[PDB]
Amino acid sequence: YKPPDINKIFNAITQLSEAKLGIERLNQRFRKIWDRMPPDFMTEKAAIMTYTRLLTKETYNIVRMHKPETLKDAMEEAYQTTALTERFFPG
Amino acid sequence: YKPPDINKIFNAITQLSEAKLGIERLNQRFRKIWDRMPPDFMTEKAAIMTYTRLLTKETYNIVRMHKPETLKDAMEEAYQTTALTERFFPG
């Protein structure tokens, strides 16, 4: 195992924004940084919180209906509102 | 009881800085905002984290020796480095 260095991780999440083009840039880097060694970082509800306040205001309105439970649902649901009427299908 | 409204609380902590004159301004408002309805906000270590990265760099160095455990120790220890060689004694 390794030492965690938590403060860079709170530093690295702070860079992410809505200037990132579309949801796919947001969901990718957040998979990169946040999954990199959380030993026990916070509870489930608080892990929603730092994710959700980052997001765009309109996407919070549609993800209000319905509200998700985990990050995976939140990452999926905020993707699906733009994945529907837009795609390039990768392989 | 009341609805919590968590997002204002993360908004209100963001205003605090090192432009606040001395530690006493920092420790007072943080007692006001953070104690106002945390139902279960986060774990103990994470509650250290949002407190500590706010603080001044030199105060992190002295509070490194020794590192505190709870917020109360952290609020006390970062006060004591300036409460020693400076006071107006209140009543």
Numbering used by the authors:
A (entry chain A), B (entry chain B): 105 to 195
Paper quotes:
Here, we have determined the structure and molecular architecture of the Ty3 capsid by 3D and 2D cryo-electron microscopy (cryo-EM) and compared it with those of the retroviruses. In the case of Ty3, Gag3 is cleaved into CA and NC domains. Similar to retroviruses, the protruding capsomers of the Ty3 capsid are formed by the CA-NTD, while the inner layer, linking the capsomers together, is formed by the CA-CTD.
We observed protrusions from the EM densities around the α-helices, at positions corresponding to the large side chains (F134, R135, W138, R157, and Y164), confirming the quality of the model and the fit. We were also able to trace the very C-terminal short part of the CA-CTD, which appears to interact with the neighboring CA-CTD. The mutations (E190A/R191A) in that region cause a strong phenotype in yeast. Strikingly, the quaternary arrangement of the PR- Ty3 CA-CTDs is almost identical to that of the CA-CTD in mature HIV-1 capsids at the level of dimer, trimer, and even pentamer. Despite the similarity in the CA-CTD quaternary packing, there is very little conservation of residues at protein–protein interfaces.
